[PDB]
Design a protein around this ligand. Structure first.
Ligand SMILES: Nc1ncnc2c1ncn2[C@@H]1O[C@H](COP(=O)(O)OP(=O)(O)OP(O)(O)=S)[C@@H](O)[C@H]1O
Ligand SMILES: [Mg+2]
Lengths: 40, 578, 127, 468
């Protein structure tokens, strides 16, 4: 049926947004780490 | 110690410059990793080195150091019950320091230096010693391993270690000129070890396979080639020989073949029993493994390492069977190296000296009086893998000129599960005549006549097959139908042998003689019945054929009584025809 | 009926990949405009020095004209000519002895060649 | 790390170019070739000297000039970034994704040529694989850790059989003595020299049944650069080895057409002007095919396994052609499709007489499949061979009138071909295939069925051919 597909796509986009949210805090920390590693 | 740098890298071949003074066929350590290589061409200040290990990642300018010595193996206690790579490195100790993958540049002693051995001297101070004499003995696995003087060493004994536990590195004998003699010595793999005399081979190499031991026998010091297409059963025959033959020591060389076969040997052999002494089969065995995906240049080294180890065990008075899993892979390695050398190929791309190398390898076999005065032998069975099954390819043809036995496998028999799949029409043996006195003395006085009659029956059956295909089996006389059926019986009940059956895998000479006697007695009685007006239909329906067919599954212990009851049943059946 | 697994896996993959791409954009924009920090001569000195570490002998070093004089200690020591190309922002490149070999240390190139190894740690730290 | 560039290009001809200086380039290294337009090509150092290094360009050399072309080092050893999220993805055969999803995050960067397995570290392949095909599972059974090619012709349905095996292959741990919940199983699929039509077929097949989720696909198209066909099995086996020996996966590897790979290898070798072989193929083709195939197997102390099924098209159905000849010399057996069985409408057209599984004899028995497996297989082979050798004598004699027991085998042979071999898209279990085999064993229990001595007759005989 269509309902299973709709529920799966909605939960998939929701958890994608959740992973984005829980990356958002550490984005700048990772950026600082990469900046300190690339520079000699 | 000549030291140079890498000038050029192209596959397994490295040009080293600054090597003025390096000697032909000396071992070199290539690169910072110290990869083992061998010089095969010298040109001005440079040297051409063939690397026995992978050359990936080598960089121009890395040092190349020549050891000043040719490719040599360490010969002494500790080789039995072991597996080695192409240049005699223990694969188990390589694993225990490297993991599940074989990385290059690993250095490890061929003989365990920390193991103690029970030294038992035989010489005394003041004795004159020549090459090949026995300094003393050490027990390895029930074998009495003899510590031999190196073949080039002569002198007078100054000191002898009393007794006890020593390692192979501890000098057990010291000569008056300061020459210390250890439990081991090195020998160049490309030099045949000297012997006093070559003897004529007068005893059979019992393989346990009926067709080979009966129709195409090989003598104790002989050589045999077993070429065939893929899946014909070369390796199965080699492993059957390793399991069941009467050799004191078996050396198996996996030259460029599957690793799963070497693993199969390593797993199964410790559980099997040595047919001679009764101990575990692996204590009899030395494995030299260079799988197909191992470095290609190491195949040639592995062949020489195997044959040199076999010769060393021959020098101690043992009879040694050397199995080469495929000499075609060694030939292909030679072709690749020759192509790197820009040599002009002779035939199908092989170098022109291929036949010379094969002849020098197969010439090391033979029954000899060793330098120590004992009698030893090396038997070589070398498998060949002709491309597309073409027996006209250079390796097969150059092999046939030197081998004494030719065990030709057939694809048509292998497809139809008729194993061992020996083409008895194309095969031959040149040792059959010379072994006749031994067969008469040890099996039966009339054994050669039984064998000749069986071969004649096979010849007649093969001839009548053409008439069968032309006219049809229905429209030929009952005598020829009897010949056809007796040939079928011979094939399926005597020539066929299941190497995986717990009983059929091994067959003694007397069991084969009994089966031949059964078949020939049945044939003569059925021929008399045909002359007696008996129709072949009821002859073919006789239950005695079931006894004849099941004879080969009878164990060696039961077979002497089964043979007697089968003889009586054969008599009674054609007596009952009246 | 089983397409939900494909949807969830695709969504998570797209999310993580877009997040990593955003991290790349952030780090490349922050890596831009290094000379605005007055500590830049001290790092570009080592940036030029590692070029001479790579090249046992260099004929000349090429960079933005304003970036040249800060590195001229190496010019005095090695005798390397200083060559100007303003398009070579945030980087140092050198010409070998024969002119055939050359090395480049532009910051964007270092980021591009390091990101493949760095992403393994970045993804684990980010999640 | 800093980037060094070499501008000393002195010679370009065909696929090779020479770079002067460049003694810093290690042998076998991977390089990036950049021309004046900014396009970047790939290349591999195939020969390095003091005076120059020799690079084989991955693509065509069109557009390269000695004035502006620059060569730079990428890595001394070709490596592939691998991770567990590769499952469900697709790649072009050089590692680049072609599924539209973003690139994976590399957990490890393994060299793509691998390293030889130490023979003392291996163990004997001992667990069978249920492919769902009776003529394989019963008579030529596939064992975890085996390499077992499928020999096929140009007109035979090899791709369909490959897809069916990929869909149906399963571990069957319930029958195993070590009964347990199923261990992870995965399929790595490598397509070499494949057409767009076959690619669409495979993508549709993997999508329509969800097998894609437990699969990794490497797809090299026929119009892709020829070097990517060489590199494709390296990437596939690198991924398979990573999964199996670092995450305990049971990996089944399928190589779609090794004939295309060997044609690519011949092209590359002739480009390098090597010594030729039997039919123009390089003399070292055995070594290369061995370095591909020998990577399969089972390792002592590790739960995972790698199984290979290389499908190849025998040119002109000639088994003595170099490709099938060397493949048979390397692999442990072969599955050969019959064109005559294809003409009779039988699918899958596997001919059991010339097919062989070397590792079969130690992969079946008690605790593995059923206790009667080997005896049943022996009996089926013997009976089918007897039927075939009866029908071949009928042609020469030209007489249907023959002994009564012969007609039982002719009928047995016809029923065997029409029911056991001919199974269509049915996913027969090993128990189902054994039931079909025992039903086909309608021959006399003792007067016939005498090739293999067995007392399993009292347990399984008497079936009346009834189907579902
Ligand atoms: N004497 C035999 N008894 C029983 N089975 C046999 C025998 N010889 C061969 N076979 C079978 O046939 C297969 C072929 O084995 P081998 O003869 O070892 O192959 P080969 O001659 O080494 O050729 P390859 O595959 O290129 S190494 C074996 O795995 C067995 O299944
Ligand atoms: Mg073999």
């Amino acid at each position: 049926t269509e309902a299973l597909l709709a529920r799966y796509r909605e939960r998939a986009e929701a958890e994608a947004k959740a992973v984005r949210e829980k990356a958002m805090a550490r984005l700048d920390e990772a950026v600082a780490l990469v900046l300190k590693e690339v520079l000699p | 110690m000549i030291q140079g740098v890498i000038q050029k890298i192209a596959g397994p071949a490295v040009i080293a410059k600054g090597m003025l003074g390096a000697r032909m066929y000396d071992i070199c350590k290539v690169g910072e990793e110290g990869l083992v290589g061998e010089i095969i061409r010298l040109d001005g200040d440079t040297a051409f080195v063939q690397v026995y290990e992978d050359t990936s990642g080598l960089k121009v300018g890395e040092p190349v150091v020549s050891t000043g010595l040719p490719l040599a193996v360490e010969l002494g206690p500790g080789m039995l019950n072991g597996i080695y790579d192409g240049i005699q490195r223990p694969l188990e100790r390589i694993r225990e320091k490297t993991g599940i993958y074989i990385t290059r540049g690993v250095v490890v002693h061929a003989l365990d230096r920390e193991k103690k051995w029970a030294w038992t001297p035989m010489v005394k101070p003041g004795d004159e010693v020549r090459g090949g004499m026995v300094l003393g003995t050490v027990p390895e696995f029930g074998f009495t391993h003899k510590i031999l003087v190196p073949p080039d060493v002569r002198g007078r004994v100054k000191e002898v270690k009393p007794a006890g536990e020593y390692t192979v590195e501890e000098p057990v004998v010291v000569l008056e000129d300061g020459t210390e003699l250890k439990m081991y010595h090195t020998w160049p793999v490309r030099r045949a070890r000297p012997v006093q005399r070559k003897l004529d081979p007068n005893t059979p190499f019992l393989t346990g396979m009926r067709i080979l031991d009966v129709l195409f026998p090989v003598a104790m010091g002989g050589t045999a080639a077993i070429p065939g297409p893929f899946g014909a059963g070369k390796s199965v025959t080699q492993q059957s020989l390793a399991k069941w033959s009467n050799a004191d020591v078996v050396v198996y060389v996996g030259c460029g073949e599957r690793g799963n076969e070497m693993t199969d040997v390593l797993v199964e052999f410790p559980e099997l029993t040595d047919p001679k002494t009764g101990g575990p089969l692996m204590h009899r065995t030395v494995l030299i493994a260079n799988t197909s995906n191992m470095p290609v240049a190491a195949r040639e080294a592995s062949i020489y390492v195997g044959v040199t180890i076999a010769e060393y065990f021959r020098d101690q008075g043992f009879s040694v069977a050397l199995m080469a899993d495929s000499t075609s892979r060694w030939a292909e390695a030679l072709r690749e190296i020759s192509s790197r050398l820009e040599e002009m190929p002779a035939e199908e791309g092989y170098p022109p000296y291929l036949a010379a190398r094969l002849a020098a390898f197969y010439e090391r076999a033979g029954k000899v009086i060793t330098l120590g005065g004992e009698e030893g032998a090396v038997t070589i069975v070398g498998a060949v893998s002709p491309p597309g099954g073409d027996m006209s390819e250079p390796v097969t043809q150059s092999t046939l000129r030197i081998v004494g036995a030719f065990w030709r496998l057939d694809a048509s028999l292998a497809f139809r599960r008729h194993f061992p799949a020996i083409n008895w029409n194309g095969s031959y043996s040149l040792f059959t005549s010379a072994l006749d006195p031994w067969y008469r003395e040890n099996v039966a006085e009339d054994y050669p006549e039984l064998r000749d009659a069986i071969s004649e029956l096979l010849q007649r059956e093969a001839g009548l097959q053409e008439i069968v295909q032309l006219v049809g089996p229905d429209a030929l006389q009952d005598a020829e139908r009897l010949v056809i059926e007796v040939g079928r019986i011979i094939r399926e009940d005597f020539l066929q042998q299941n190497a995986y059956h717990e009983v059929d895998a091994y067959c003694s000479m007397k069991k084969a003689y009994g089966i031949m006697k059964m078949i020939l007695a049945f044939y003569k009685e059925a021929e008399a019945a045909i002359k007696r007006g008996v129709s072949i239909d009821e002859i073919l329906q006789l239950p005695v054929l079931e006894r004849i067919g099941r004879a080969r599954y009878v164990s060696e212990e039961e077979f002497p009584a089964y043979f007697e009851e089968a003889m009586k049943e054969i008599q009674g059946a054609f007596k009952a025809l009246a | 009926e089983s397409a939900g697994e494909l949807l969830v896996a695709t969504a998570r993959t797209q999310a993580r990949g877009e997040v990593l791409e955003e991290v790349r954009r952030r780090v490349r924009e922050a890596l831009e405009a290094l000379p605005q920090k007055p500590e830049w001569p001290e790092v570009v000195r080592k940036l030029a020095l590692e070029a001479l570490e790579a090249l046992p002998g260099a004929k000349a070093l090429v960079a933005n004209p304003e970036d040249l004089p800060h590195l001229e200690a190496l010019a005095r020591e090695r005798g390397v000519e200083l060559q100007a190309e303003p398009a070579l922002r945030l980087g140092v490149r050198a010409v070998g002895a024969e002119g055939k070999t050359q090395v480049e240390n532009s910051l964007l190139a270092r980021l591009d060649r390091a990101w493949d190894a760095l992403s393994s740690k970045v993804a684990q730290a980010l999640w | 790390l800093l980037k060094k560039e070499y501008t000393g290009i002195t010679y370009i001809s065909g696929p090779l170019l020479f770079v002067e200086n460049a003694k810093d380039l290690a042998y076998g290294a991977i390089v990036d070739i950049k021309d004046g337009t900014g396009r970047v090509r790939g290349g591999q150092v195939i020969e390095v000297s003091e005076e120059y290094a020799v690079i084989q360009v991955f693509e065509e050399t069109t557009g390269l000039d000695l004035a502006t072309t620059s060569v730079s080092l990428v890595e001394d050893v070709a490596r592939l970034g691998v991770s567990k999220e590769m499952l469900g993805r697709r790649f072009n055969g050089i590692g680049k994704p072609i599924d539209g999803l973003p690139p994976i995050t590399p957990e490890k960067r393994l060299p793509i040529t691998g390293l030889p397995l130490n023979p003392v570290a291996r163990r004997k392949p001992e667990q069978f694989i249920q492919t769902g095909i009776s003529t394989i599972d019963v008579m030529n059974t596939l064992v975890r850790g085996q390499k077992l090619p499928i020999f096929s012709g140009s007109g035979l349905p090899a791709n369909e059989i490959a897809a069916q095996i990929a869909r149906q292959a399963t571990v069957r741990p319930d029958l195993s003595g070590e009964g347990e919940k199923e261990e992870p199983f995965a399929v790595v699929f490598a397509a070499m020299g494949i057409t767009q039509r076959e690619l669409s077929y495979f993508i549709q097949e993997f999508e329509r049944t969800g097998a894609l989720s437990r699969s990794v696909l490497f797809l090299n198209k026929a119009d892709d650069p020829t070097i990517e066909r060489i590199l494709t099995p390296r990437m596939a086996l690198t991924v398979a080895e990573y999964l199996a020996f670092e995450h305990d996966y049971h990996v089944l590897v399928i190589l779609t057409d090794m004939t295309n790979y060997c044609e690519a290898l011949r092209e590359i070798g002739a480009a390098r002007e090597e010594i030729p072989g039997r039919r123009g193929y390089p003399g070292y083709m055995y070594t290369d095919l061995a370095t591909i195939y020998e990577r399969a197997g089972v390792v002592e102390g590790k739960k995972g396994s790698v199984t290979q099924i290389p499908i190849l098209s025998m040119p002109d159905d000639d088994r003595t052609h170099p490709i099938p000849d060397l493949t048979g010399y390397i692999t442990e057996g072969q599955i050969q499709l019959s064109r005559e069985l294809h003409r009779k409408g039988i699918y899958p057209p596997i001919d059991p007489l010339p097919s062989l599984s070397r590792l079969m004899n130690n992969g079946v028995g008690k605790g593995k499949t059923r206790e009667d497996h080997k005896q049943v297989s022996d009996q089926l082979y013997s009976a089918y061979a007897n039927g075939v050798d009866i029908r071949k004598l009928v042609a020469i004699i030209g007489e249907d009138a023959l002994t009564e027991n012969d007609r039982r085998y002719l009928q047995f042979a016809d029923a065997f071909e029409r029911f056991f071999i001919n199974q269509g898209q049915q996913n027969r279990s090993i128990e189902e295939s054994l039931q079909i085999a025992w039903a086909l064993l309608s021959m006399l229990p003792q007067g016939e069925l005498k090739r293999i001595s067995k007392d399993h007759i009292g347990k399984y005989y008497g079936q009346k051919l009834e189907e579902i």
